[PDB]
Amino acid sequence: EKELLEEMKHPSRARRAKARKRLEVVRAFLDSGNRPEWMILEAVPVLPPDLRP
Amino acid sequence: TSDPVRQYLHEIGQVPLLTLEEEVELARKVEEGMEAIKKLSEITGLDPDLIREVVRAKILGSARVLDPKTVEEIDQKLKSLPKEHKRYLHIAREGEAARQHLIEANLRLVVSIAKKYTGRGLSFLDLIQEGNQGLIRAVEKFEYKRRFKFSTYATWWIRQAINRAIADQARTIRIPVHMVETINKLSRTARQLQQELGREPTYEEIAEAMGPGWDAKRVEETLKIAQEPVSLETPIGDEKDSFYGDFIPDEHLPSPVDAA
Amino acid sequence: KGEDVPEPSVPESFRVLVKELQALALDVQTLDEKDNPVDIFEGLASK
DNA sequence: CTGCATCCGAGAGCTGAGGGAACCCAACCAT
DNA sequence: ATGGTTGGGTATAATGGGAGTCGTCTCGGATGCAG
Known part of the structure; x- marks a missing residue:
């Protein structure tokens, strides 16, 4: 969770979306x-x- | 990706076969390995199966998960034995490895025999696995002193294993092997009579053709007990909405009128 | 007998649904207002 | 690192009534 | 006391299977392209 919270600061939008999906x-x-x-x-x-007779 | 038959066949093909020299070498190694196992059992005074388990654990290695402590303790409890009487242990290890190579190389006999047993209620892969079980039994019991090829001794075990698996797993309601064979005889007699006479035979003719101890009544009962249950979801009518089981009433629980 | 019908209970089809959902390795549990388990099977399925 | 842009696989499409392939061999347990 | 059942054996040689489907539309990830 800490690793993805750190990842949530990336400028990349696709990376942020993938990290959010993992975090969910x-x-x-x-x-x-x-x-x-x-x-x-x-x-x-x-x-x-x-x-199941 | 899919079609596990292709994956299994490819994996089997990746293992090369053996030549006559290799076959005789492996069989001889297996024989001396079992003899060495028995000699070590006598030397240490222990039950043979337990030492066999220790050797199997050592060949398979830590990779195969009987616990590590016991097998390690007895492994070093055998290293205590003096030299000259130790070669046997190395021979047993070699023989177990030889069994592994022999089985992997001769797996193809299983597919070759089993490919002509499809359509008897068991899928191909179950037939193949049961054939590997028969192959392990044949390998363990093989005696190379007769100078006979492995295929001759292996085929009988393979057929026996496949046939027993067919008798035990082909039907939902388990029927003993002897009665399954009796049903088999009844079916073959009926089809032969039909073919020769040119029409569906009666029960009396089949009973007469079986011989003493067979009457029409027993034949009816035998055909009766050979019946297999049907599915509750058999589609009825044109539309895919009516099933057979939807027309089956409960006759066990008391009705509301009866309870009142 | 001339009286009025009593209050209803849990239908059997919901019990069948619960049994089939547990068979898929899913724990379906009925709870009351205080988050405590409520046994709808009348103690006939508890070891 | 954006944005397009196909490319593939998954999951749906009214109700109701009615639908009909061995043989042998010898030991062993239930009753 | 009795049949029906349960497990074991068969020795020329025998060594990578086999069936196949086509007149639907829409939605959401997945991969590869230019900028």
């Missing part, structure tokens, strides 16, 4: 408290049988 997701993760590694599955849930 980074700040969403920081605010929600979710860990990024949870986007990788280790155990896959199995739906109850009555909904």
